[PDB]
Point group: C12
Chain length 108, copies 12
Amino acid sequence: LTDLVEQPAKVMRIGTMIKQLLEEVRAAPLDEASRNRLRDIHATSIRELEDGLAPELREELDRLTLPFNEDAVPSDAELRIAQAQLVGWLEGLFHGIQTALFAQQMAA
Amino acid sequence: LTDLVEQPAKVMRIGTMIKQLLEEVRAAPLDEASRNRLRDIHATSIRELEDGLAPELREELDRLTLPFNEDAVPSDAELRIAQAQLVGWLEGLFHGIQTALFAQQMAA
Amino acid sequence: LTDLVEQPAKVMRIGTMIKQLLEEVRAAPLDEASRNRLRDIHATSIRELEDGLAPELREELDRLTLPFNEDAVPSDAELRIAQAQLVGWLEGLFHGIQTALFAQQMAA
Amino acid sequence: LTDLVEQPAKVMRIGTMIKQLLEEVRAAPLDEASRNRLRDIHATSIRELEDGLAPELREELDRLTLPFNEDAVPSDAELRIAQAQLVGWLEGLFHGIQTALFAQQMAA
Amino acid sequence: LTDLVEQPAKVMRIGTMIKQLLEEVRAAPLDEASRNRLRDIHATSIRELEDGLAPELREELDRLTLPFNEDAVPSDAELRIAQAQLVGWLEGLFHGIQTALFAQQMAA
Amino acid sequence: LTDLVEQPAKVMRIGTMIKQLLEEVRAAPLDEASRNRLRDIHATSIRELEDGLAPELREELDRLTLPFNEDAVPSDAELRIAQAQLVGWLEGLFHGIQTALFAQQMAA
Amino acid sequence: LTDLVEQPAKVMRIGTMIKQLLEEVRAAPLDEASRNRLRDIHATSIRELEDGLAPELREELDRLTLPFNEDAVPSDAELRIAQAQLVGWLEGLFHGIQTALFAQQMAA
Amino acid sequence: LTDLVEQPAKVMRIGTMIKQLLEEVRAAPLDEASRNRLRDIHATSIRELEDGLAPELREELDRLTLPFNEDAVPSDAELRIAQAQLVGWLEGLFHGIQTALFAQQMAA
Amino acid sequence: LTDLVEQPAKVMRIGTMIKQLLEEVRAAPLDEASRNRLRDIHATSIRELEDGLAPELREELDRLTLPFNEDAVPSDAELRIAQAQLVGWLEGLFHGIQTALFAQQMAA
Amino acid sequence: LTDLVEQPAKVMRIGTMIKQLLEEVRAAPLDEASRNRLRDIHATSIRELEDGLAPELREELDRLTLPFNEDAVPSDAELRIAQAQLVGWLEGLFHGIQTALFAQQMAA
Amino acid sequence: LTDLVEQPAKVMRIGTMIKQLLEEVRAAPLDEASRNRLRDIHATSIRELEDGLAPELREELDRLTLPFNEDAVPSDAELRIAQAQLVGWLEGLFHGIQTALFAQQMAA
Amino acid sequence: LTDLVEQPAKVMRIGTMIKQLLEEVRAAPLDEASRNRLRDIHATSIRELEDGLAPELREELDRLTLPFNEDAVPSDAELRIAQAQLVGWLEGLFHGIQTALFAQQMAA
């Protein structure tokens, strides 16, 4: 299925980034400036993520994803929600790749 | 196994996404916007779950599933209930899958 | 005997869904909307369990369970009670099944 | 001894159900509705327990058990006493079962 | 000495019951109804206990035991005292039986 | 060993009873009735202890023992002292017994 | 040497009785009746220890101990002090004995 | 991949420096002077990071990174966001390095 | 060295007695009576310690020790200082004993 | 490569001095005298580090570090920031060195 | 180097003493009488310490040591300072002796 | 090693002394007298440290060292800084020493 993740080095790069940033948001509350920043960051990280994925997962991700509004600073809640979604989605994707590796390299 | 899960990678993917989002709802209370977003995510996530499930499990899931009304923003409580339901349903589903796998690996 | 649980995949599934939901009700209090929602879920979840059980256990479960009243929203308490009973009943059913399997595969 | 518990699967089911509900009573205080439901559950559960027990133990259990007064809702305390009793009685019963069983497995 | 405990399955049954009920009394305070109930329970459990014991221990137990008054509800303290007495007495009795088993089955 | 404990089962029995009751006195404060009952239990328990002890230990125990006056209800403190005394005396007694047993099992 | 503790069974007995009683005085405060009681127990317990000791240690212990005054109820403090001294003295005596035994059975 | 990180020693240095400083930001709130210094450190550190990275990753990092507004002192929050990002990006980068490396060491 | 502690059993007894009493001083504050008793115990205990020590260590201990002023009751603090000193002096003494002893047992 | 750290003894020395000092600033707040003192120590400590580094790392470190102003006492915060940066920078430098050594001694 | 500590049994004796007494000072605050006492003790312990040391360490110790004033009771702080100095000095000295023993007895 | 530490026993001695005194300063706040004494100890301890160090390390230490002015009593903060500095410098020094020792023991 590895046909799904075109650039894996890149997806565990960005996924690790977003995971880290979410762990930051939990730490302590943000101000308008920070929340704004993290929105921008989220848009860019999804751009870069679609690049490292096959059209299958690009479009699935697009279907699950809700872009943000720029006319308003999103809440610390919306930021937690938006990033947690991507963290779960990625962690389940790599669960797929690694379970495939273990079963197959077990036969072999 | 096929009679259960047509697309295993996809159902585990989406399942992890829902589990993580349930962990966020538990983390701290949401606002009007975030709980709205999570309502959407819940709807779309069921959409995407139906694809990787045989029609039996499609319809069983539907019988267990409770759509939200777009005429009111649901409470953090309803969101905890809706997401928790899919998390339990999914884990009992995959527990079935693994009992089947262990049966095969015991047979051969 | 084994003929008691006609569909084992399905009862471990639904059982896990009830287990999770009870854990949510314990988490923090629900509102009229949420607890109403779990009434619905409890009624249909029993339906779906009855599908996966032999006439013996269908009829026993029917004797032990007290359907909810549609005429009023049940308490956070009654929901814990109703879910807990099926959780204990199922966990004891599966304890019977697994001690039986260990007995047989201990024989052979 | 074997003659004591004629239906083992059923007495283990019912037992686990009773123990689980007792732990719910511990969780948080119940309302009049919940206390009523849990009383019923207690009565019906003794009904189902007598079935899987030899008349000897049927009658000993009945001598140790105390029906409730249907003219009044029992306290969360009376429910704790009654269920606690059946939980202890049951574990002390099966403890008999497995001490004899282990004696047999050591014998052969 | 096993000549002492005529019906052992029964004494570890009841002993386990009373132990459990005492663990309940410690949990949280009782009302008049519960304390009354637990008195009744104590009388019956001693009746059933004397049955499973040789005349030796029946009468020793009688000498150590103080029946309750029915003209008054005993305190949570008297109930703790009364049951703790029987729990200690039983646990020391089974200490006797099991130390005998280990020493003798060691020689043998 | 005989020169110490004429009836070992009985002295260990009663000893455990006293230890458990001391654990209850520690648990929470008693009332007029319960502390009265425990006074009785203490008297009777010494009665029963004398039987399983050689006359030497009968009289040594008596020299260490302090009867209560039936003209006043003793404090929870006096009860803690009286019961603690027998618990220590008994454990040092049985510690003597086990040093003797280990001597025999080392000899043969 | 070993001739110092004439009756070892008795001194480990009484020693354990003093150890327990000190642990009670620490538990919670005593009243005039209880602490009076421990005065009596301390005086006779020393008597009974003197029985089980060679002239050497009888006379040394007499030099170290300060009998109590019968003319006043001793403090919770003096009782802890008086009991603690015999506890340390005995524990050091038995440490000597056990290091001697290990030395001898190390020799042979 | 190897082509991705051209100067490994240098990118690891800079990374550890950034992670350490982020943990200082967590330690306690900073003053305007400290926030200014740490901003500078952030800018200079991205300068030094671009050097040890292939133009591919140079440009991806630049697309993900957000320069600060020198016309105002950023919050302790913006500093937490920016450094947190580079820490996640870096660990997800080197995670790529060692997953490929381990693949090679398993191959040969 | 061996020449240093002429009576080892006795110095170990006295030491354990002193250490135990110091821990009582720690337990809770003493009264004038207890402080007086414990002073006496301190004086008498140094008397008994000098006996089991060679004149060398007899005199070194006397040079390090400070008699108390019998014209006034010493604080719980002075008692902590004096006993604490003898406890440290004693452990540092026997530490000498066993370091030399272990040297011998490694030699042969 | 190894030619980067000209004097390794000296840089682990000075590095440990900075590590400890940062741990003190965290311990409890400093005064104008102390924090002035750490300004001096930071400036000279960088000097002494530059001695033990190849031209490469001297110049890089110079680019990353921001000397302090002699015209004002720096905050407890700036001191933590300034020390933390060198702590991370050094720890990353030595992580590079040790992974290189393990690589070489893994080769041979 | 053992030429340095002339009487080792004595230095670990006194060192252990002073260590213990310092652990006492930390426990709870002293009164004028106790602090005075512990000063006296410190002077004497240094006298006895110089005896068990070669002139080298006698004079080094003298150079590091600050005698106390007798015209004033030193603070609990000065007493902690004075004793901690000696505890550190001694522990470093014995670190020297024991590291010498291990390296040499390793060659040998 | 000689090029580093001319007198190893002495530098480790004094180092441990300084470490212990730093532990006391941390323990609890000092007075005018104690902090004065520790100033002296710090000066003298550097005096004594210079002896066991090659002239290189003498002068490096001096470049890192900051004397106190005898015209003012330094704060507990300055003392924490001054002592912490020597503790870090010393540990990085001895860490260098042990890397050298392990090099020798790996070579031979």
